[PDB]
Amino acid sequence: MNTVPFTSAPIEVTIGIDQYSFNVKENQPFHGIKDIPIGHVHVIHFQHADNSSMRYGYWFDCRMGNFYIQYDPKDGLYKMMEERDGAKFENIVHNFKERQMMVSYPKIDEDDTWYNLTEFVQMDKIRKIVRKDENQFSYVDSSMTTVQENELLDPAHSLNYTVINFKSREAIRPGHEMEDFLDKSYYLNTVMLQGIFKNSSNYFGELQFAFLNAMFFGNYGSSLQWHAMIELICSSATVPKHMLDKLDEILYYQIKTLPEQYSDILLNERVWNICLYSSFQKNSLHNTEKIMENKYPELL
Amino acid sequence: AMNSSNYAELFNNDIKLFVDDTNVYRVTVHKTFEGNVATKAINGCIFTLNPKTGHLFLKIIHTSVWAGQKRLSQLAKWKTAEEVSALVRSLPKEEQPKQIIVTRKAMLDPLEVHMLDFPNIAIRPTELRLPFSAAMSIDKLSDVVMKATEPQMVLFNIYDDWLDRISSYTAFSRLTLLLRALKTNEESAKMILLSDPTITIKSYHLWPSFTDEQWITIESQMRDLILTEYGRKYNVNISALTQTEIKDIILGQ
């Protein structure tokens, strides 16, 4: 039940809050979003009406401070800021609420969608991928490249996802070339899980974050990363049972949430066909395969 | 990707090797007592050739390397890549190739993966149809492969001494014409090569000791063989064919 107030809405804009969105008119008396569920990260995002290339947003967690949005007419965007004066913030918010100038984060208690999409996503992990230590929230936009993309392969303006490369020395032990290329279990279990992520929760958290950045911003590097992380699991002959079961749930909710219209831009045909139909784990993703076949049959 | 457009690159001064894996995994298919089918492997070879110098590194693949292994056709690609990468590591730095061209695209991943330690060596496919599978029609090459009782590398110059008299471009053209004829009609091609017994093959050579004038005759005979076989195959009267049509068919690649 936290609140992100807006100073004002000087330019016409579509505002997203998690999987929801609504349009705001130029100079409409809009002063923010209230009733934001505590306990999850959230993302507030924007697409300007006069320029759809302006597509950007902020990941935040209200447990970490009082945040608000204010338009900057010099830089031409809605910026998140933290208000350090608690008393000043609660008074602004109270006044905006009393005047009913805020949108409510839509309830419907039966719906666990947002939890299911962000189950493993943690603000401290987000802040290691998006590096701007002076703020508690993280800016992402549709054009930011990933550290892996950069070349062939402002610091805060790149997404520092974990590099996955199937044809790298990291992925392939000397003397196990064929084994390791054909069965990625070493790369998944020893290199990625034990070595870099430390655990499957952190791995899934980055996977979930990558999907959400791809979906909400159309960020191409994030879509690459999401697909890479799925393929690495499906291409491993040996994966702990609890991870495969969790992966099925994770992908199910992601595919469920995707706009059927953006199916063609957000889903990689080669990767999905391999994962669902050819891979070691082709029979381990029952729910995901069932929703894909029924929602996007023209893809497979 | 190597093709008929960037063909001269083969004969420049940048070291490069062709690798052909067609003859690595070789079998005979036969019936068992119960009437099922079974394969029996026979010795094979990797054909690795420097087209500029004619140096051929023939790695003989003894049947023992398949013992107890599954999915041999897949394994054969990886074995090829293992051996090519071992050969590269065995060469002094100044002899290592700058590029390796694979004759079949299925070799690209296995070789790329085995060559990770050599990031500056380009691994490339080709659009050329090369007749290197016919290398086992060269009697001395076939002989050394079939006689091997253990894995064994043997080095040859596949151009014999031709480079004393012709360019690499011409030598490669002669080699691929000969191999194309051997691949198309082996019996006929050998008869053209080994008919005049006054022309012999030196103990240290693979091909007969033809004079310049005799190579011209041999070469037209090989072109005629290829054309004749082309007509027999498609049921076409090669009489009607034009000089342009003729050249293309001969080239294959």
Indicate the number of domains in chain A.
2
* Contact state of A167 with B82 under an 8 Å Cβ cutoff: no
Q: Where are the domains of chain B?
A: 1-160, 161-253
The answer to whether the Cα torsion of A210, A214, A216, A219 is positive or negative is positive
| Interatomic CA distance for residues A194 and B109, integer angstroms | 27
Listing DSSP states for A118-135 in one string gives: HTT--HHHHHHHS--TT-
Mutation site for A-interface testing, chosen from B113, B115, B117 by largest number of A Cβ within 10 Å: B113
List the CATH code of the domain at B161-253.
1.20.80.40
Torsion angle of the four alpha carbons A277, A280, A283, A288, in this order, in degrees rounded to the nearest 10: -70
| Interatomic CA distance for residues A261 and B246, integer angstroms | 54
Same structural domain for residues A127 and A262? no
Same structural domain for residues A213 and A69? no
Same structural domain for residues A161 and A109? no
Task: Name the minimum distance, in Å, from the CA of B25 to any CA of chain A.
Answer: 17
| Interatomic CA distance for residues A250 and A204, integer angstroms | 8
N-terminal to C-terminal alpha carbon distance within chain A: 42
Name, in order, each residue with C-beta under 8 angstroms of A175's C-beta and a sequence gap of 6 or more.
none
Same structural domain for residues A245 and A274? yes
CB-nearest to B109 from A169, A174, A181 is A181
| Interatomic CA distance for residues B55 and A215, integer angstroms | 55
Fold of the domain built from segment(s) B1-160: Nucleotidyltransferase; domain 5 (3.30.420)
Beta-strand pair A103-104/A77-82: unpaired
* Contact state of A177 with B75 under an 8 Å Cβ cutoff: no
CA-wise closest residue to B48 among B73, B16, B78: B16
**SS3 sequence of chain B:** CECCCCHHHHHCCCCEEEEECCCCCEEEEEECCCCCEEEEEECEEEEEECCCCCEEEEEEECHHHHCCCCCHHHHHHHHHHHHHHHHHHHCCHHHCCCEEEECCHHHHHHHHHHCCCCCCCEEECECCCCCHHHHHHCHHHHHHHHHCCCCEEEEEECCCCHHHCCCHHHHHHHHHHHHHHHHHCHHHHHHHHCCCCCCCCCCCCCCCCCCHHHHHHHHHHHHHHHHHHHHHHHCCCCCCCCHHHHHHHHHCC
Residue B48 pairs in a beta bridge with B19, B57
Q: Is B112 on the interface with A (CB under 8 A)?
A: yes
Helix (H, G, I), strand (E, B) or coil at A7: coil
Same structural domain for residues A93 and A51? yes
| Interatomic CA distance for residues A64 and A83, integer angstroms | 11
Question: Which residue of A lies nearest to B75 if distances are taken between CA atoms?
Answer: A178
At residue B168's C-alpha, the angle toward residues B162 and B170, to 5°, is: 80
DSSP state of A298: G
Same structural domain for residues A135 and A155? no
CB atoms within 10 A of CB A73: 8
DSSP state of A1: -
Residue B101 pairs in a beta bridge with B18, B124
Task: Name the minimum distance, in Å, from the CA of A82 to any CA of chain B.
Answer: 48
At residue A159's C-alpha, the angle toward residues A153 and A160, to 5°, is: 70
Phi, psi of B50 (to 5 degrees): -90, 115
**Last residue before each break in chain A (C–N > 2.5 Å):** 153
Within 13 Å, how many C-alpha atoms sit on residue B17's CB side? 25
Same structural domain for residues A67 and A171? no
CATH number for position A157: 1.25.40.550
Q: Which residues of A touch B78 (CB under 8 A)?
A: 177-178
Q: Are B49 and B56 in contact (CB under 8 A)?
A: yes
Q: Which residues of B touch A174 (CB under 8 A)?
A: 117
Structure tokens at B185: 């009609």
Cα–Cα distances in angstroms (integers) from residue B152 to residues B17, B21, B74, B146, B148, in the given order: 19, 16, 22, 11, 7
Q: Which residues of A touch B82 (CB under 8 A)?
A: 177
User: What's the burial of A239, exposed, middle or buried (CB within 10 Å: 0-12/13-18/19+)?
Assistant: buried
| Interatomic CA distance for residues A20 and A107, integer angstroms | 11
Same structural domain for residues A261 and A249? yes
* Contact state of A181 with B113 under an 8 Å Cβ cutoff: yes
Q: Which helix (H) or strand (E) holds A286?
A: helix A286-295
Residue holding tokens 């069965």?
A183
CA-wise closest residue to B134 among B107, B100, B158, B167: B158
Which of A97, A117, A143 terminates a domain? The answer is A143
Which residues form the domain of A83?
Answer: 1-143
Phi, psi of A206 (to 5 degrees): -70, -40
Same structural domain for residues A253 and A296? yes
Q: Resolution of the experimental model in angstroms, please?
A: 1.8
* Residue ranges of E strands in chain A: 2-5, 13-17, 20-24, 32-36, 42-48, 51-60, 67-72, 77-82, 103-104, 138-141, 145-146, 158-159
| Interatomic CA distance for residues A191 and A197, integer angstroms | 9
* Contact state of A168 with B110 under an 8 Å Cβ cutoff: no
Question: Which residue of B lies nearest to A168 if distances are taken between CA atoms?
Answer: B116
Q: Is A169 on the interface with B (CB under 8 A)?
A: yes
Name, in order, each residue with C-beta under 8 angstroms of A168's C-beta and a sequence gap of 6 or more.
B116
Separation of CA A174 from chain center: 35
| Interatomic CA distance for residues A252 and A286, integer angstroms | 9
Question: Which residue of A lies nearest to B112 if distances are taken between CA atoms?
Answer: A167
Same structural domain for residues A168 and A97? no
Mutation site for A-interface testing, chosen from B74, B79, B116 by largest number of A Cβ within 10 Å: B116
Structure tokens at A221: 């590097």
Which of A143, A162, A191 terminates a domain? The answer is A143
* Contact state of A168 with B82 under an 8 Å Cβ cutoff: no
Question: Which residue of B lies nearest to A171 if distances are taken between CA atoms?
Answer: B113
Q: Are A158 and A174 in contact (CB under 8 A)?
A: no
Same structural domain for residues A205 and A138? no
CB atoms within 10 A of CB A72: 11
Name, in order, each residue with C-beta under 8 angstroms of B36's C-beta and a sequence gap of 6 or more.
none
CA-wise closest residue to B100 among B84, B116, B86, B89: B84
Q: Which residues of B touch A177 (CB under 8 A)?
A: 78, 81-82, 110, 113-114
CA-wise closest residue to B251 among B176, B186, B159: B176
Same structural domain for residues A158 and A279? yes
CATH number for position A29: 2.60.34.20
CA-wise closest residue to B52 among B157, B183, B154: B157
Q: Are A41 and A118 in contact (CB under 8 A)?
A: yes
Question: How many residue pairs from chains A and B have C-beta atoms closer than 8 A?
Answer: 23
| Interatomic CA distance for residues B25 and B41, integer angstroms | 7
Beta-strand pair B99-102/B122-124: parallel
Residue holding tokens 């009607």?
B240
Within 13 Å, how many C-alpha atoms sit on residue B145's CB side? 26
Q: Are A179 and B123 in contact (CB under 8 A)?
A: no
Listing DSSP states for A163-219 in one string gives: P--TTSTTT--TT-HHHHHH-THHIIIIIIIIIIISSHHHHHHHHHHHHHHHHHH--
CA-wise closest residue to A212 among A37, A42, A49, A2: A42
| Interatomic CA distance for residues A145 and A140, integer angstroms | 10
